Every structure is written in C-alpha cells, then in structure tokens.
Write a protein that binds this ligand. Structure first.
Ligand SMILES: CCN(CC)c1ccc(C(=O)NN)cc1
Length: 330
C-alpha cells in the first residue's frame, strides 16, 4: 500500500504545516501537524477542557463506530519549546492520503497548553519519530508509520515541504519526479528515539564550505534551524546590523537586509537554503526588526534541522531494519 497527502503552511511564515487526516467511522477529518520529532498522535477532542479549545476541529469518539477506549491508558507529553498536552486514549481507524491503519492509538487531549489553544489551525499532532518515544502508559503505543510499515510497498515516508506553498507527505514510495539529481543517504542513530544524523558541515552564502560534524535531528515539527552558536554567529555576521537579542529571544536582523543562503552537508552532497527561507518577518507588527530563521541550539541540548532546513530538500525517512535519512535537492 501507499498514501499521499498534501501538507499546507498554517500561515504566511510557514510557522508549521497541517495535513488532513481521517479518523473514525464515518470519517472525522482533522488537520494534524506531522511531527518527525515526536511519537504521539494526539487530537483536540470532545474531552478537551472547553476553555482550552479555540476554533479547532475536535474528534468525538462517541460518534465513531470503530472507536474503542484503550482502558487505563493515559498520555502526557512536553515538547522542547515548553508546549504540552495530556489525556486518555482510544483506538480507531486512521487514514492519511488513502493509507489506512486500523487499531491506531488516537490520544484524546483533556488538557493542552496555551500555545496549542492559540493555534486554531492545528487540530493535533501526528508523531513520526520512533515508537520508543511514545508517551502512552502503561502500554506504550506505536506510531501511524510503525503500524503501517509492514503493509507499505517500501518501509519509508517522505517529507517535501514547501516554501510559502503546499507540499507533500508520501508513505510507502519515493516519488522520483519530486526531486532533482540523486538522493544522498546518511546514517541514523535511533538511540534517543529521533531521526538523529550527522551533517558534514556548512557554508554561509558564497563562502567556503567548513567541514565539521554537526549531530542533530530531522524535526518537521520545529519551525526553525537550530545549530551550534559558532555556526549561527558565523551566519549572522554576514548580515549588517544583525544581533542576538536577549529580550526578543534570538537573532534579529534589519528587515531591509538581503539574507545570504546557508548550505548544509549531507555526506559529500550539499543542500542550499535560500536566504529568503531564513526570514521570519517583523518581530511585532510594523517593526523593522525581523526574526531570524537560523538560531542557536545552545541550551536546547541538541541541534535541530527543522522546517527551515527540511523545506529546502526532498527528505526520505527510511524505516528499514537499519533506518537511514535521505536528502535531495528539488
Ligand atoms: C507551539 C505549539 N506547536 C504547534 C505549532 C508545537 C508543534 C510541534 C512541536 C515540536 O517540538 N515538535 N517536534 C512543539 C510545539
């Protein structure tokens, strides 16, 4: 089997991407944030604290003839930005882009943090990291990908995120028309439950490539590119007037600037992030200070290849017995 679904930015900055997902019988379509940095499929629901719901579409398990309470199961998750959610668990039929999994754990939120409440466009998350990170207790549950993978034509999914435009998540096949050149594969460590890999270095604009190992995770659920302070300082030093602002919470730059590109290495291959992808716009409406899309990972504890980086590539998440990650230009 295969599936293919379009993913759409939630706003004009590509702050996140939403993908329609069919849950239950008859189908209830919710728009979920596909998240290769976590392993829970959770939704706004009829059980979510009413004051914490603000425009989201909710899953109502009582209206699904295939929903079953997973008795005794609870979940609770916190993300690296401080966002969180928690609740109980149902199993139900879940379909993405024509690919159907029966008996998928659908984690129903009882509580969500304000950061989720305020994102009216995001009806929940669909985790695509390794199932060892799943938070359901006392019986850990499998991701949608993990459940699907034996049925898939090939045990892979691909992320093809757009810049200020829709893109595609495919399951079970590699669309050879969706990228240019060849796909370069690189090793993955699953020890921390993430799609963790090592970039071979970077360049700023038209500068020389610096060969240096940068461990990090491929996280579709993180907006920006978070790299070591040395790398990030080298980038922003090429933008007149750019500075790290403690009050704003990262690097800002004059909105009048033209940003340089940023290149990262994948083996001997190179992915180029155009300068425009690194512009996250005014820090507040009408400001001439703009927020940067490359930020320091110092204090996070890990480097994160978020959407800023991933959207510059066609990315293969290869879930074979020994997982790997592939990147191509597009
Ligand atoms: C700000 C609240 N949202 C919705 C955009 C989040 C989505 C994904 C993550 C995350 O870290 N995923 N790996 C954290 C938060």
């Amino acid at each position: 089997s295969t599936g293919s679904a379009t993913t759409t930015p939630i706003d004009s900055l590509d702050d996140a991407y939403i993908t329609p997902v069919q849950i239950g019988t008859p189908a209830q379509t919710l728009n979920l944030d596909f998240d290769t940095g976590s392993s829970d499929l959770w939704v706004f629901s009829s059980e979510t604290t009413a004051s914490e719901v603000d425009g989201q579409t909710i899953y109502t398990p009582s209206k699904s003839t295939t929903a079953k309470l997973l008795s005794g199961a609870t979940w609770s998750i916190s993300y690296g930005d401080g966002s969180s959610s928690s609740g109980d668990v149902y199993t139900d039929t879940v379909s993405v882009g024509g690919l159907t999994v029966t008996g998928q754990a659908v984690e129903s939120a009882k509580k969500v943090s304000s950061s989720f409440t305020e994102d009216s466009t995001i009806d929940g998350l669909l985790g695509l990291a390794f199932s060892t990170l799943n938070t359901v207790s006392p019986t850990q549950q499998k991701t949608f990908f993990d459940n699907a993978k034996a049925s898939l034509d090939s045990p892979v999914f691909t992320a093809d995120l757009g810049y200020h435009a829709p893109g595609t998540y495919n399951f079970g096949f590699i669309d050879t028309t969706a990228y240019t050149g060849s796909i370069t594969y690189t090793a993955v460590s699953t020890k921390q439950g993430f799609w963790e890999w090592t970039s071979t270095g970077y360049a700023v604009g038209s500068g020389t490539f610096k060969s240096t190992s940068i461990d990090g995770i491929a996280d579709t659920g993180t907006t920006l590119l978070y790299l070591p302070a040395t790398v990030v300082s080298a980038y922003w030093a090429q933008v007149s007037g750019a500075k790290s602002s403690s009050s704003v919470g990262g690097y800002v730059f004059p909105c009048s600037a033209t940003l340089p590109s940023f290149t990262f290495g994948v083996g001997s291959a190179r992915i180029v992030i155009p300068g425009d992808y690194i512009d996250f716009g005014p820090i507040s409406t009408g400001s001439s200070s703009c927020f940067g899309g490359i930020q320091s990972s110092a204090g996070i504890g890990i480097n994160i290849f978020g959407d800023v980086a991933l959207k510059a590539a066609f990315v293969v998440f290869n879930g074979a017995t020994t997982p790997t990650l592939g990147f191509a230009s597009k």
